[PDB]
Amino acid sequence: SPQPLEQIKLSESQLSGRVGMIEMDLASGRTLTAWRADERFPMMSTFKVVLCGAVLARVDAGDEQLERKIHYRQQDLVDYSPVSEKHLADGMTVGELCAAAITMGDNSAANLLLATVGGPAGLTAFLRQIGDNVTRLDRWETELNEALPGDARDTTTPASMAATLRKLLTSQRLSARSQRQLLQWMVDDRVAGPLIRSVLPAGWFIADKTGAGERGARGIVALLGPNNKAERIVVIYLRDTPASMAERNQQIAGIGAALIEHWQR
């Protein structure tokens, strides 16, 4: 594979869409690769990591408990609820809801959690509180995945998302246990985690959260690194491309291949 930046460019050429990408050292925040890093892209389900970061903040403050069991109704369910639809009779704990939202892509679990933090407005306020003055959530699942051209709703920028993720995972804004919990949820992703490992060379660490929307919108926020270490944050978003999901997945994997082959930068 070619250099990272050259591969990213080839991806836009082949997809006819915009690609947004940031490669950042997790420990220090050093930005290695930045492409359309200040441009807006729909977050799609990747917003779920920020969501649970807000939940953990409430837990740290004593305003929430991951153990708290929430009982919900069938009418509360939205499209794609693989875990939540199985607990209409017994409910789910707040912690279980975050695990379902992040590791299984459960949309109803996400909406239930979003309510607890003040909805889209409440989460956006949380982002402003941690210094992210760009990212914004305006809608709920699944409407937030609409990805209309020129629509600023439910968007982030590669730079903002990378910085925010780093803040949640390492800045001590969240307690030690909470930072460890958020990290483990990403490590446990069952939607794309296993698939990615199946194609990663031995020795490479992966933790992630993916998303998919309309008009080709696709994205992934992850931790990646050799020697089984979460060395860098890699954020890649795609938008406005008519390409098949397979090819969009292939292009993102291709950018990853370029990083892997040319890691020392």
CB-based contacts of 180-188 (< 8 A; 24+ apart in sequence): 181/56, 181/66, 181/95, 182/49, 182/52, 182/53, 182/56, 183/207, 183/223, 183/230, 185/49, 185/52, 185/98, 185/99, 185/102, 185/103, 186/49, 186/102, 186/222, 186/223, 188/99, 188/102, 188/103
Nearer to ligand MA4 among residue 115 and residue 253 (C-beta):
253
Choose which of 34, 115, 134, 257 interacts with ligand MA4 (CB under 6 A). 257
Choose which of 9, 214, 253, 262 interacts with ligand MA4 (CB under 6 A). 253
String of contacts with ligand MA4 for each residue 121-140, x by CB under 6 A:
--------------------
Q: Does 260 bind ligand MA4 (CB under 6 A)?
A: yes
Which stretch in 117-125, 144-152, 171-179, 250-258 sits in contact with ligand MA4 by CB under 6 A?
Answer: 250-258
Residue type, 228: N
Quote the least distance from Cβ 138 to ligand MA4, whole Å: 26
Q: Are 136 and 164 in contact (CB under 8 A)?
A: no
Choose which of 117, 123, 169, 224 interacts with ligand MA4 (CB under 6 A). 224
Reduced to 3 states, what is the DSSP secondary structure of residue 56? helix
String of contacts with ligand MA4 for each residue 194-223, x by CB under 6 A:
--x--xxx------------------x-x-
Site for ligand MA4 in 226-245 (CB under 6 A): 234, 236
Q: Does 1 bind ligand MA4 (CB under 6 A)?
A: yes
Decide: residue 262, CB within 10 A, 0-12 exposed, 13-18 middle, 19+ buried.
middle
- The structure tokens listed for 27 are 């420990």
Nearer to ligand MA4 among residue 32 and residue 70 (C-beta):
32
The span from the CA of 223 to the CA of 206, in Å, is 6
Catalytic positions, written as ranges: 45, 143
Q: Which residues bind ligand MA4 (CB under 6 A)?
A: 1, 196, 199-201, 220, 222, 224, 234, 236, 252-253, 256-257, 260-261
